[PDB]
Each structure stands twice: as C-alpha cells, then as structure tokens.
Design a protein around this ligand. Sequence first.
Ligand SMILES: CCCCCCCCCCCCCCCC(=O)O
Ligand SMILES: CCCCCCCCCCCCCCCC(=O)O
Lengths: 161, 161
Amino acid sequence: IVTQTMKGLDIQKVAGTWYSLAMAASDISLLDAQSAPLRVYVEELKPTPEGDLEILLQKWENGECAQKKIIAEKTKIPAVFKIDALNENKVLVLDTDYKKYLLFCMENSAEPEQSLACQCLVRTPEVDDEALEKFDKALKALPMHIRLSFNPTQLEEQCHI
Amino acid sequence: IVTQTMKGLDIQKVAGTWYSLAMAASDISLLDAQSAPLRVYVEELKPTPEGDLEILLQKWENGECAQKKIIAEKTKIPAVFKIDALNENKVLVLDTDYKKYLLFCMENSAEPEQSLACQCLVRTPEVDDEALEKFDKALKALPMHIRLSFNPTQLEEQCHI
Ligand SMILES: CCCCCCCCCCCCCCCC(=O)O
Ligand SMILES: CCCCCCCCCCCCCCCC(=O)O
C-alpha cells in the first residue's frame, strides 16, 4: 500500500543513531498502548556489508521497557527490506537525507491497512518541523488512524517515558 | 492557548446528534488508552434556552463503555463555555457550519498544552475529508502529540468499539 520509496538509496549511509520523532498507524490498536504491537522506538541502524540491516530498538514488553535487535534482510529493491518475523513483514524506506531524517513504513505482506505503520526518524533529539512536514505529506494519502509525536525530553528517555 | 473561535455562533443551531470523527491532544496520555481522561465520544448536543449547553457522551470507565451527561455553562463569549468539573475547564467552539461539522477544543484553566484536547464533530457516520481538512489546519499551530480518527463502522459502535 505504501506508494513512494527512496530512489538510489544507500543503505550504508543510514548507519547510526536515530530517534523515533513520530509514528502513525492504519489502526489505533497498533500504537494505542505502551505495549502495542508496532509501538517500537529506534536506537540505531546497523547495515551489514552484504547490504542486510540490523536494528536496535526498545519495545515495552510486560509493563517494562525492553531493548531489541531485529534483522531486516535486504531484497532486490534497495529501499525494501523484509524482517525475520513470522509472516514476512516488509520495511519500506520512503525518503531520507541520511543526516537529518528517515521516513520508513512497515506493512504486512498481502495485508496493508490492517497492519501498516510509519515513522519519522531524526538524527537528533530535536523536533524537526521540516521532517514532520515530509512525513505528514507522505502519509496524507495513506489510511492512518493513529498518530503520535514525542518531545526532546521523551526522546532522551527509554521508551519515550 | 486555542487561538481561533467561531464568530457570531448560534449555539441553538448546534443542537442534535454528533459524531467524534477525530480527536487530538497535547499529551498522549490524554487519548492513549480506552480509559484516558479526555477520550470522550459525543452523542448529541443539547443547549438550554438560557444559552447553556448540556452534553451527552460516552466515556470508557472501569473497562466498560459508560454514557455521561455533562453541562457546559455559557459565558460572555458566545463560543466559550465552562463545564462544571473541578478546575473550571473551558470548552471552545472554533468553527462550524451547523449541519456538516463542528470543531471545538477543551483546555485547562491557566494550563493549556498540559491539558488541551480538540475534536472534529460531524453530523453523519461518514468520514468527512473537508472537515478533517479544517480540523488539521486548525491544530497545525497547536502543540498536539496524539491524534486518532474513526471509521464509519466504529462510529456506529458504542465507544467507537
Ligand atoms: C530501513 C529503515 C529502518 C527502519 C527501522 C525498521 C523498524 C522495524 C520494526 C518492526 C516491528 C517489530 C518490533 C516488535 C518486536 C517483537 O517481535 O516483539
Ligand atoms: C460546544 C461544542 C460541544 C463540544 C462537546 C464538549 C465535550 C466536553 C467533554 C469534557 C471532558 C469530560 C469527560 C470526562 C467525564 C468524567 O468526568 O469522567
């Protein structure tokens, strides 16, 4: 369902620390609680020389902020990865400037809108109006029903408080 | 903190059934859970001939969808009401066409952004892109951190499911 992707993406250049400035989902139950399914906070991206991609994130599990390491296997499209969970979930890089932000979405295979979540990643704990601009514009199309945003304070905290 | 209001508002003409198409809050904890503080669904508005305003809403309380009747006492400004809870909370009518939608916000007295929530009300269980347009434009300024939207199905349901 995600319609735009970043052309000529250089996945090595996205390596580094990132902040989940904002997130949006097609379903409220995707982001509603602290424990919700795709309510995940990004730490840093770590691509492998084979073009793969390892991800370090926090995920509130069992009334507690847990760290996590996911792996996204690159595919034939530079901007689309597939993580190693059950039901081949696709992670799509929409856009990025490598040093200011990253807009990615992640959807179910064969089931978009029921499972579809997008994030605005920034390199600093500062809210980026330009970035949020592009993010809201990108999802303007998409059928999003929930939408969060975090403050600098919450971004320096584990699990955004 | 809410900066725009509806001029020459005719509070009698807002009488009737309404749907909470969308909501936004300055704080995630205002709308996060089913039980959150300003996560309230509107049924119908009922103004009194003295220009007062009685409100019927649903509010998930104790893991259960409860109905509720609030009263908003009119003030010297036609578009601003004050409901009878502790700490004089102000309800502000931003805009409306009486027969398509209503954009209102409700804030704390002397404490905006910590407590500030806004809704897009529509007369039908249809999502209204024009309406959501105006709503997102109105809050574009405001410091909102959470934002929900509901589908026709959820709007015919008590507590939006
Ligand atoms: C290419 C840009 C990288 C963007 C980061 C992608 C984040 C993937 C997160 C997938 C959700 C999985 C988290 C839930 C963990 C669990 O299984 O409990
Ligand atoms: C003038 C337009 C009318 C808009 C409707 C205003 C809705 C007011 C809701 C105030 C929040 C109070 C709900 C919580 C109830 C409780 O005390 O448990």
